Structure formats: C-alpha cells, structure tokens
C-alpha cells in the first residue's frame, strides 16, 4: 500500500510493516511526526538540539553524528521530505505506514532503518469536515479546521485545512527571565484540488501548503539537573530563536488500465529558516535555505490473480542548499562562512514478484542510481581565509530479495535481503583548513527472517535480523566506521471483546561498532535503546450519557548513549499515558488526557561542551482537554 505495487507482491508481504489509521493517531495524541513512536513500535525520534535535526532511529540503525542525512526518511505521498522538515505537524493524514528494514530499492537514499510514509487524504464526492480544538499544560493549545468535498461534482473536488498548534515549554533563561522557552508554535495551511472526471481512467492532483513554525530551543540544562528548569545560559545572552517556513507544491497524475496503473508525480519544496542561539560565550547564527524538487514516474501491474506482479520506476530528485554561519564572541568574530552545496539524482528501478505455488513466492528488485553533488564555500576562522569548491558523481546499485511460504491460510513466514545507502557527496557545513574531497557512500545491508499471523481478531508479527553498515559518515565529515545491528522484534494486537483491543510490543537489539572500526570501535551505536517494549489497551464502554472510550498506554525505553564515545548514557525509563473520550452528542466528542502520568523525566539528547556534559530533557507530564465537532 506504500510498497508502490500490488497488495499481493513480494515487497508488500515479505516485510515487517505497520499501518496506523487516522482515528488511531488521534486516540494516541499523535499530533506531529515526533510522536509517531507512540504508535510505531521500534521507532525512536528525538530532537538533537532542535526541531530541524532529528535523531530518528529504527532497527538499531541511526543517524549518528550527521543530522542532515537520517537512516529513516519521511515520505508524504511518496514525496521525500527535506531532512530539516521531518519533524512537522500532521495536518490531514489518512494513515501512516512504516516499513522496517532497508528500502533502498523502492525509495532510495537515506532508507536504511526504514521509511515512514504519510498518506494524505484525497477529497472526494462525499462532503467531509471537522473542527478539533484543545488546550493543555504550559499554556499549550491546538486548533484545526478542515473542509473537503465536491467543487463541481463528477469532476473537481477540493479540501482545505488550517492548523495552529502550540506545544509550549516552561524553561527559563536566567539572562532574560523568560519562562516559556523550549516549545514550538506552528501555523499551517493546506489546499488540495483533485480532478477526477466521472467516467474516465485518469485523475490529477494538486496540493499546496505553507507551514511557519517558531521554536525557542537550542538550549540545554546541566547533565545531572534533569528536573530543573533554569537553562545553562550565561548572563548577557539573549533567548534562542528560530523560525522556519516551508512551502510545498505537489502535482500528481494517475492512469488506470485493465492490467496496469501508471502514476506520475512532481513535487517542489522550499524552506528557509533563521536560527540563532547562545552557546557559552558565543552567539551562533546559522540561517539556511533549501530548495528540493522530485519527479517520479512509475508503471505497476494491478491486480491479482497473476503469476508475476511488477513495478517499474524513474525517479529524479534535485536539492540545493545554502548556509551562512556566524559564530561570534562578544567583542569580535570567531568564525564566519557561506556555502552552497547541491545534490541531484536520476534513478531507474524495478521490483518483480513470482508466485510459483499458490502458497510460495520469490521476489526481488534492483535500483540503478546516478548521484551528482557539488559544494562551494568560503569563510574565515580567527581571521584566516579559507574556502574551496568541487563537483563529483558516483552511481550505486541496490537490491532486494525475498521469499515467503504461507504455512497456513493466514500464517506466513518470509525472508529478506535488502540494501540501503546514503550517497557519496559533500560536507554540508564548511570546515576551515581541510580541502573539499567528497566522502563515499555509506552502505547498509540487512538480512531478515520473520513471520506474520493475521486472523480477524488477531495480528501477530515477529522478526529477527542483522544489518551491517559500512563506510559510515561520522571538524570533518569523512567515512570511517562500521556497525553491526542485530536483534528481534515482536508486535501483536488482539481484539478480545468487540470495541476493545490490546496492543503489545517489544524489541531487543544490540548495535555496536565493529572491532575493526576506524572510530568508537566496540562501543554501542548511539540513539539505539538496548531493548524497548510497550503495551496499550483501549475500548468503548457504553452508557446512558453517551459512549465513553478509555485508553491506557505504557511505554518502556531501554538504556542508550548519545555519543560515539559512550560517555553520555540515558538508561531505562517508562511512561504511562492515558485518556478518556466521551461522545457527548452524536457529532461532538470531548476528551481529557494526561500523558506521562507519573511526571517521569529523562534525557532527550546530550553532548559534551568542553568538559561539561549538557542535556535536553523531556517536558514532563501534560494534561489536556481536546474536543472535536465534525461536520455533515
């Protein structure tokens, strides 16, 4: 379904995936990307410094030192997002689908842990709309209006969503005495046009959007002062402040035949954010501009029964980025810079499945890919002019292989050999002194053995796996690293009564650098909890006053480190979330929710500034009230 091909294919079934629907996202309070862990087992997302840089990790594959190229990439309707826009608000999602294991063949670069794929909802002939509106701790609120439906029935349909989410923090800046820092405040707009003539084989889409988030958060607290609120900012320093604006435009296209379906895509995305924050005696100021565009074109064979399922594709993605840095002492400059740097890619790919028996299929795909790249920077450190330029190119060939025997009618066993990668290319930030030689591609490769058992009332899914990453990109950005992640996952779901379900999940992973690694040899790979497990019951009691729907959810995250040197460890924590919905009237549902009930604190991220360990910390417990009237 986000395998880009048939429901029956190798890639759809010989893979550990999880899909979460729009109502489930609300029930768990997933109002933004970075809360998907609540519903996607094995996924860990945290800010590394702030919003713009995630430390997304999955199956013990991670970022690790380089935050402009993640191991999991977020695609929205198949369109890759900018790395700096991965943590975004969810505005009108129908579902989110997660594919675990490398996905280099079907999706491409930065697809080593997996991919997350948001499927936005298309307006159709049925009129549909709603209001959703909350208020929470720390003077946080949230407000969403959505309206969709026919503009000229049988021809043109449309939708509009407006969102204002503010999820505020309560941190303090000694220097100024502001006491509302640490949070984010986004305003977002989003329109869709769909042109689906009533008796024709083709559609066309158009989407526009505009997000503007402000965040105050490039600030840390003492590494052993987690419950505290006073940020480590020396007097004189101002508050930190960033503000990003992303504009996106997608242009879709579809065409159905008896035997084949051809999609065309062409997206655009332009970001520019200001970012400035104090760090120690310095004030850092690092605004940036992005400008990517992707066009994809692909044929695929619907539907079954067929002995050969196929997909073919032609992808092309061009990104341009520009950075200005300015690190500054009170009395004089320390460093300044300015760097354009770009990456383009053409890629053909194909993925085949062969159903030999009724119960046995063998599948495999290959992706050819020609990457280009090109930095150009100049700067001045401690008054010493530097700067270089450089073009480059390279081409890779990733591939998959899978096999699945159906033990019974609804219990299959599969096997996989997949292959992810981050491309060769140039360091995004200028470095003084070292001349610009492009680093070579990181190269992951996973072997997976797993099973799935699907009844009407029960889904069970478990897998075992080993990934080997090499030439890992890890001042400088060169490739000097090797890692081995191996572990086991279990996800299971059971509708014991009607209206009720019970989720459970757990994973145990060991991900370490190899003994022959040029760096951190032997150490645990950062941001990868040793083990993690969670569970959550939710159902529908029924009453004279209207249906009540209570949810209870627990999550346990094992010990992990933030650095290669393994000097900065978090160590285990768990959190209990809960909520109670109430269908007061037939169209209006009010609910109250406290999540992290026991105000447990823990560290989101850390790094060592000189000799002092500093850490960012979780906000704590939030209680809130959230109501949704829906239209028509």
């Amino acid at each position: 379904t986000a395998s880009k091909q048939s429901s029956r294919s190798a890639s759809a079934n010989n893979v550990s995936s999880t899909v979460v629907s729009a109502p489930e996202l609300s029930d768990a309070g997933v109002t933004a990307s970075d809360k998907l862990p609540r519903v996607l087992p094995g996924l860990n997302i945290e800010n590394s410094g702030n919003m713009l840089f995630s430390t997304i990790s999955l199956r013990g594959v991670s970022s690790a030192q380089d935050f402009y190229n993640p191991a999991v990439t977020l695609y929205v309707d198949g369109v890759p997002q900018l790395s700096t826009n991965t943590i975004q608000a969810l505005t009108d999602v129908q579902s989110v689908e997660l594919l675990r294991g490398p996905q280099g063949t079907l999706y491409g670069k930065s697809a080593q842990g997996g991919i997350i794929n948001i499927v936005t909802q298309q307006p159709d002939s049925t009129p549909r709309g709603y209001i959703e509106g909350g208020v929470s701790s720390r003077d946080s609120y949230r407000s969403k209006f959505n309206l969709s439906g026919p503009i000229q029935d049988g021809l043109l349909y449309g939708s509009v969503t407006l969102l204002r989410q503010v999820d505020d923090g309560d941190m303090i800046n000694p220097a100024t005495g502001s006491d509302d820092l640490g949070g984010t405040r986004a305003s977002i707009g989003n329109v869709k046009l769909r042109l689906a003539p009533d008796d024709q084989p083709w559609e066309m889409g158009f989407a526009a959007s505009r997000e503007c988030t402000r965040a105050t958060q490039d600030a840390y607290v003492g590494w052993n002062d987690i419950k505290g609120r006073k940020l480590s900012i020396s007097d004189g320093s101002p508050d930190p402040y960033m503000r990003r604006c992303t504009d996106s435009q997608t242009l879709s296209g579809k065409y159905t035949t008896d035997d084949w379906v051809f999609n065309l895509i062409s997206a655009w995305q332009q970001q520019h954010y200001s970012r400035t924050f104090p760090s120690g005696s310095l004030i850092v100021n690092m605004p940036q501009r992005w400008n990517q565009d992707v066009q994809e074109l692909r044929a695929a064979t619907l539907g079954d029964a067929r002995t050969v399922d196929m997909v073919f594709g032609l992808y092309r993605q061009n990104t341009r980025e520009k950075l200005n840095s300015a690190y500054d002492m009170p009395t004089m400059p320390y460093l300044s810079s300015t760097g354009y740097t770009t990456a383009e890619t053409l890629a053909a790919y194909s993925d085949l499945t062969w159903h030999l028996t009724d119960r046995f299929d063998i599948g495999g795909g290959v992706r050819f890919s020609h990457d280009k790249s090109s930095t150009q920077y100049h700067g001045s450190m401690l008054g010493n002019p530097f700067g270089d330029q450089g073009k480059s190119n390279d081409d890779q060939v990733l591939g998959q292989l899978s096999a699945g025997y159906m033990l019974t009618d609804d219990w299959r066993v599969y096997t996989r050999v997949a292959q992810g990668y981050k491309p060769s290319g140039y360091n995004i930030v200028p470095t003084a002194g070292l001349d610009a030689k492009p680093f070579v591609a990181e190269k992951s490769i996973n072997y997976e053995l797993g099973t799935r058992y699907e009844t009407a009332d029960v889904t069970l899914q478990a897998a075992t796996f080993y990934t080997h990453t090499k030439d890992m990109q890890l001042q400088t950005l060169s490739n000097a690293g090797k890692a081995d992640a191996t572990g086991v996952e279990l996800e299971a779901k059971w509708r014991f009564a009607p209206g009720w379900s019970w989720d459970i999940n757990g994973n145990v992973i060991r991900s370490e650098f190899t003994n022959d690694s040029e760096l951190y040899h032997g150490n645990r790979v950062p941001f990868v909890p040793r083990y993690g497990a969670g569970s959550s019951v939710n159902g529908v009691i029924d009453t004279r006053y209207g249906a009540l729907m209570p949810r209870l959810a627990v999550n346990l995250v094992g010990p992990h480190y933030f650095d290669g040197d393994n000097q900065l460890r978090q160590g285990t924590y768990a959190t209990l979330d809960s909520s109670l919905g109430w269908q007061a009237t037939e169209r209006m549902n009010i609910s109250v929710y406290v999540d992290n009930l026991f105000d447990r604190r823990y560290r989101t991220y850390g790094y060592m500034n000189g000799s002092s360990a500093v850490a960012q910390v979780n906000m704590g417990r939030t209680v809130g009230i959230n109501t949704r009237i829906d239209f028509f």
Side-chain angles (χ1 to χ4, degrees), residues 1-64 66-131 133-166 168-229 231-390 392-408 410-436 438-453 455-543 545-585 587-632:
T1 155
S3 51
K4 298 193 185 168
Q5 74 197 266
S6 124
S7 342
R8 268 195 86 218
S9 64
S11 313
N13 297 289
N14 304 341
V15 155
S16 188
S17 80
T18 270
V19 189
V20 164
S21 68
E24 293 171 320
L25 283 152
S26 307
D27 291 357
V30 181
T31 59
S33 328
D34 59 337
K35 285 169 180 189
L36 286 162
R38 303 185 193 206
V39 302
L40 302 187
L43 184 54
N44 288 106
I45 298 173
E46 290 291 358
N47 296 186
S48 100
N50 68 328
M51 241 192 175
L52 302 170
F53 314 110
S54 58
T55 50
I56 189 155
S57 92
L58 172 97
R59 292 284 196 82
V61 184
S62 201
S63 292
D66 171 27
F67 305 118
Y68 296 105
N69 298 77
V72 184
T73 280
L74 178 49
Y75 302 83
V76 168
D77 289 306
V79 178
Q81 299 293 278
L82 291 168
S83 60
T84 45
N85 194 9
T86 286
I87 291 148
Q88 44 174 241
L90 304 194
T91 77
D92 69 323
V93 296
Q94 157 146 23
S95 51
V96 297
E97 176 162 16
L98 166 51
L99 294 195
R100 307 191 176 77
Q103 296 302 339
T105 301
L106 284 166
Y107 286 101
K109 59 158 166 141
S110 295
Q112 301 165 281
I115 64 83
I116 292 167
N117 180 61
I118 296 187
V119 200
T120 58
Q121 52 203 343
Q122 284 313 272
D124 69 71
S125 49
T126 318
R128 208 173 275 94
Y130 58 88
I131 278 290
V135 82
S136 331
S137 313
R138 302 177 291 284
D139 195 17
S140 302
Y141 59 95
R142 159 176 217 274
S143 304
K144 186 157 137 194
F145 183 110
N146 162 264
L147 186 47
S148 82
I151 289 191
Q152 172 162 313
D153 214 332
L155 184 61
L156 191 61
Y157 315 78
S159 85
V160 186
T161 313
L162 294 206
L163 177 49
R164 172 66 174 166
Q165 264 185 236
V166 158
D168 255 357
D170 63 341
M171 302 297 200
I172 312 177
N173 181 12
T176 332
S178 332
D179 55 344
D180 62 333
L181 305 179
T184 55
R185 302 183 186 161
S187 295
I188 306 187
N190 206 299
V191 304
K192 295 186 166 63
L193 283 169
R194 180 154 159 277
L195 173 45
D198 216 329
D199 280 318
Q200 287 287 66
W202 62 261
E203 302 177 24
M204 294 210 92
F206 180 73
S209 66
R210 188 129 164 68
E211 147 200 300
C212 270
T213 326
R214 307 202 175 177
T216 59
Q217 50 162 194
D218 266 283
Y220 305 77
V221 78
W223 172 276
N224 266 311
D225 190 358
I226 57 188
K227 281 154 186 156
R229 282 174 52 184
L231 289 153
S232 304
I233 301 187
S234 67
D235 282 341
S237 289
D239 299 316
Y241 174 75
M242 74 158 292
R243 182 225 192 186
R244 95 177 157 192
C245 312
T246 335
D247 296 25
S248 329
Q249 303 86 18
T250 309
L251 176 44
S252 147
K254 202 173 170 198
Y255 195 116
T256 316
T257 285
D258 308 73
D259 289 333
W260 285 85
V261 45
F262 304 64
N263 318 60
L264 160 153
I265 277 190
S266 168
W268 287 270
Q269 213 175 347
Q270 322 93 43
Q271 196 167 82
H272 76 78
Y273 58 83
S274 76
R275 161 139 165 278
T276 100
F277 64 97
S279 153
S281 290
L282 303 171
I283 60 176
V284 181
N285 197 298
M286 284 196 56
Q288 202 167 19
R289 267 211 215 284
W290 293 81
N291 203 320
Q292 107 166 343
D293 62 284
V294 175
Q295 34 286 357
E296 182 174 36
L297 168 44
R298 57 192 169 76
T301 70
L302 25 64
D304 102 289
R306 192 165 182 147
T307 35
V308 175
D309 309 330
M310 301 177 175
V311 208
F312 296 92
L314 286 195
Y315 177 110
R316 135 87 145 90
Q317 150 162 50
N318 170 86
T319 314
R320 299 147 61 209
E321 155 283 330
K322 159 170 161 153
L323 192 64
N324 296 71
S325 287
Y327 297 82
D328 285 325
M329 289 288 279
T331 51
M332 67 196 63
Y334 184 96
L335 177 52
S336 81
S337 86
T338 324
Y340 297 61
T341 135
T342 84
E344 182 168 36
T345 312
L346 320 199
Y349 68 96
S350 76
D351 194 314
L352 278 36
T353 308
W354 185 359
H355 296 275
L356 277 59
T357 306
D358 263 23
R359 47 171 44 195
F360 177 79
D361 53 353
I362 224 182
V366 82
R367 184 182 196 117
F368 169 75
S369 171
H370 179 79
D371 316 300
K372 300 174 75 203
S373 52
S374 98
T375 200
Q376 174 179 344
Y377 59 95
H378 74 103
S380 178
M381 194 176 288
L382 302 152
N384 290 344
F386 68 97
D388 206 18
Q389 63 181 30
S392 170
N393 49 85
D394 168 45
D395 20 63
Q396 305 301 330
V397 175
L398 317 198
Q400 286 160 7
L401 268 196
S402 42
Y405 185 88
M406 303 262 228
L407 296 176
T408 88
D410 44 15
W411 176 19
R412 92 183 290 149
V413 151
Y414 66 95
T415 227
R416 259 201 105 207
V417 171
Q419 188 187 12
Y421 97 116
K422 307 178 193 191
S424 99
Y426 284 82
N427 200 3
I428 289 284
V429 319
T431 95
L434 225 175
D435 276 309
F439 50 84
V440 324
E442 181 165 324
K443 278 273 190 195
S444 270
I445 181 150
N446 181 312
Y447 306 95
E448 189 181 339
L449 180 149
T451 183
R452 157 172 45 233
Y453 171 62
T455 288
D457 295 338
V458 157
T459 311
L460 205 149
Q461 196 169 32
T464 201
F465 56 95
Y466 162 96
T467 325
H468 175 94
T469 312
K470 90 188 186 180
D471 295 298
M472 303 193 357
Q473 297 141 6
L474 287 183
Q475 219 192 19
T476 219
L477 204 135
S478 158
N479 35 237
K482 284 187 197 175
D484 280 333
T486 89
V488 293
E489 4 158 80
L490 163 83
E491 185 188 337
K493 190 162 166 164
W494 177 35
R495 1 266 128 76
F496 50 102
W500 292 74
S501 97
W502 186 32
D503 313 326
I504 215 151
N505 79 89
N507 76 59
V508 191
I509 312 163
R510 117 156 44 218
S511 181
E512 290 166 341
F513 296 88
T514 69
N515 290 323
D516 54 292
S517 183
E518 193 174 316
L519 277 176
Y520 319 119
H521 66 74
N523 298 347
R524 296 275 180 167
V525 152
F527 313 112
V528 175
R530 271 180 168 78
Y531 55 98
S535 192
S536 55
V537 64
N538 59 91
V540 183
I541 302 160
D542 217 307
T543 84
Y545 296 98
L548 265 48
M549 306 104 72
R551 172 155 183 286
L552 212 46
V554 91
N555 182 48
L556 180 83
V557 179
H560 48 273
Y561 292 100
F562 303 129
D563 50 338
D565 281 311
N566 288 206
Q567 208 67 36
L568 294 167
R569 124 190 272 261
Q570 170 48 32
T572 308
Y573 63 95
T575 57
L576 172 84
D577 303 5
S578 109
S579 55
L580 181 61
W582 173 36
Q583 273 285 350
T585 98
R587 55 167 21 90
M588 186 197 75
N589 175 320
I590 309 158
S591 79
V592 295
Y593 69 92
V594 50
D595 59 37
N596 188 1
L597 176 52
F598 297 116
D599 200 30
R600 174 55 176 282
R601 311 309 200 83
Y602 61 84
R603 288 170 270 267
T604 276
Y605 181 68
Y607 82 105
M608 205 122 70
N609 180 295
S611 65
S612 45
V614 282
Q616 291 180 336
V617 291
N618 72 325
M619 316 225 164
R621 169 176 56 221
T622 341
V623 306
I625 188 183
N626 187 84
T627 156
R628 163 153 163 158
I629 300 167
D630 36 34
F631 306 167
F632 312 101

